[PDB]
Design a protein around this ligand. Structure first.
Ligand SMILES: CC(=O)N[C@@H]1[C@@H](O[C@@H]2O[C@H](CO)[C@H](O)[C@H](O)[C@H]2O)[C@H](O[C@@H]2O[C@@H](C)[C@@H](O)[C@@H](O)[C@@H]2O)[C@@H](CO)O[C@H]1O
Length: 449
């Protein structure tokens, strides 16, 4: 047995890492007011997306490879997109669905049918509620907690009543009241109602912000942090890289909009395939999930360009992963024992691993049997035993001469490393630094389409 190193991910963390892709949906008054941030004075009368089709949202997201949908149910403007008992500023007083509308219900039913996991975004900062005030702090917290209970206990909400993520945005406007939140109480309610549901927050929860909105994870990306270094004035670069000494497993989630804004604006176009590809490589390709926001329009529908783009993106990835050129390749180098053989790097088994206790740098050489054309290499650690690798690089033998392909810091759950297209039969993976004896479960090679 190899001894585990560092903090270990929960089962729900590993599942998210394996799922790789989650979708964000920002829809609400701001959609009708053509804005990114609302005041709380938006007229509920304007809110009438009669064409809204949540099943269409879910169907397209499922067909284009998303595994989770995080729904904004109350943005900063404080308008609530389900008929909560706790405020009259909700869809209840709007014309939508003749006043009997429930978006969380509509989405959850669709998500249930498609087995799409569900997350929920409830804004801590609330620009509408008169309870959002330093002298009503207990009252706002009780209002917030009340809605968490409404959302998380109702078997009509979620994917068959289950939520996979709760999102607690840290953003707050310059002018706003300095309300402090009852974090522990919220977290306990979430564990009561939803077990080990993942929680994105500014505190030491299971998910953290990566510290930017471009969908850019750092390299290194340590999926762990010291809770002491979090909070609302966590360093952006600390978020972006995590902590090589971190004491809790933490997913640095890469959130980004397919458009310049989080909400839909008519004058904006979605990002190009090329752009989405770059993002993909710097999120999923750095061992962290991509959370792509797709904002429905005034009609309540995904924009046609956006849908098309989502298909192109799916096609791209499908083509990318179609043939693993390293599958079955012969690998030489040191190995701890037969149970940790080199051959476990290309055996197609995520349950088999290579490992070596030899002195660094450790070199694995792959022989593909014949020259192949590729421009991506994939590596994966066994995070059940902890994240370890701190530095590595990759060399390819071209025309009898070893040349640099690429290099990186962390591997993590899964690392993709692009390089210039090469035709090569032999490949070297050189591990230069590791926090403990390195394990790898997989090395793969692909050609981008
Ligand atoms: C430091 C800061 O507040 N920056 C603003 C963004 O807030 C952060 O958002 C991230 C997620 O990207 C995370 O919640 C942090 O805790 C926040 O501090 C802000 O974006 C906010 O989050 C988006 C996903 C979206 O819902 C947006 O409407 C929300 O305000 C953006 C908004 O343009 O401004 C940043 O300056």
């Amino acid at each position: 047995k190899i001894k585990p190193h560092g903090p270990l991910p929960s089962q729900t963390q590993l599942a998210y890492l394996g799922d790789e892709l989650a979708a964000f949906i920002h829809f609400g008054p701001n959609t009708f007011y053509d804005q990114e941030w609302g005041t709380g004075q938006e007229d509920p009368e304007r809110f009438n997306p009669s064409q809204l089709d949540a099943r269409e949202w879910v169907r397209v997201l499922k067909e284009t490879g998303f595994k989770k949908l995080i729904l904004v149910v109350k943005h900063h403007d404080g308008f609530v997109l389900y008929p909560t008992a706790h405020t009259d500023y909700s869809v209840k007083v709007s014309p939508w669905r003749r006043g009997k509308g429930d978006l969380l219900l509509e989405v959850s039913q669709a998500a249930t049918e498609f087995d799409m996991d569900m997350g929920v975004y409830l804004s801590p900062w609330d620009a509408h509620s008169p309870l959002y005030h330093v002298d009503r702090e207990a009252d706002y917290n009780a209002y917030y907690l009340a809605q968490l209970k409404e959302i998380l206990s109702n078997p009509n909400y979620g994917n068959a009543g289950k939520f996979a993520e709760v999102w607690m945005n840290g953003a707050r406007g310059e002018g706003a009241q300095k309300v402090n939140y009852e974090f522990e109480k919220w977290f306990e309610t979430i564990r009561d109602l939803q077990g080990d549901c993942l929680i994105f927050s500014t505190e030491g929860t299971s998910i953290r912000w990566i510290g930017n909105q471009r969908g850019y994870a750092g390299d290194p990306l340590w999926q762990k942090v010291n809770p002491d270094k979090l909070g609302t004035e966590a360093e952006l670069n600390y978020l972006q890289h995590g902590d090589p000494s971190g004491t809790i497993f933490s997913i640095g989630e890469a959130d980004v909009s397919i458009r310049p804004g989080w909400f839909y604006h008519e004058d904006q176009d979605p990002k190009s395939l090329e752009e989405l590809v770059e993002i993909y490589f710097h999120s999923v390709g750095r061992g962290t999930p991509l959370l792509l926001n797709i904002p429905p329009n005034q009609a309540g529908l995904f924009d046609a360009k956006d849908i098309e783009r989502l298909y192109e993106f799916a096609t791209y990835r499908n083509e990318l992963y179609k043939e693993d050129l390293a599958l079955g390749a012969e690998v030489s180098g040191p190995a701890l024992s037969a149970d940790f053989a080199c051959r476990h790097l290309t055996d197609g088994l995520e349950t088999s691993s290579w490992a070596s206790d030899a002195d660094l740098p450790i070199q694995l050489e792959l022989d593909l049997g014949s020259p192949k054309t590729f421009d991506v290499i994939e590596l994966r650690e066994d995070l059940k035993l902890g994240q370890r690798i701190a530095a590595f690089h990759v060399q390819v033998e071209v025309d009898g001469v070893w040349q640099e392909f690429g290099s990186g810091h962390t591997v993590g759950y899964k690392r993709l490393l692009r390089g210039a297209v090469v035709e090569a039969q032999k490949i070297r993976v050189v591990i230069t630094e590791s926090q403990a004896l390195p394990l790898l479960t997989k090395i793969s090679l692909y050609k981008t389409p």
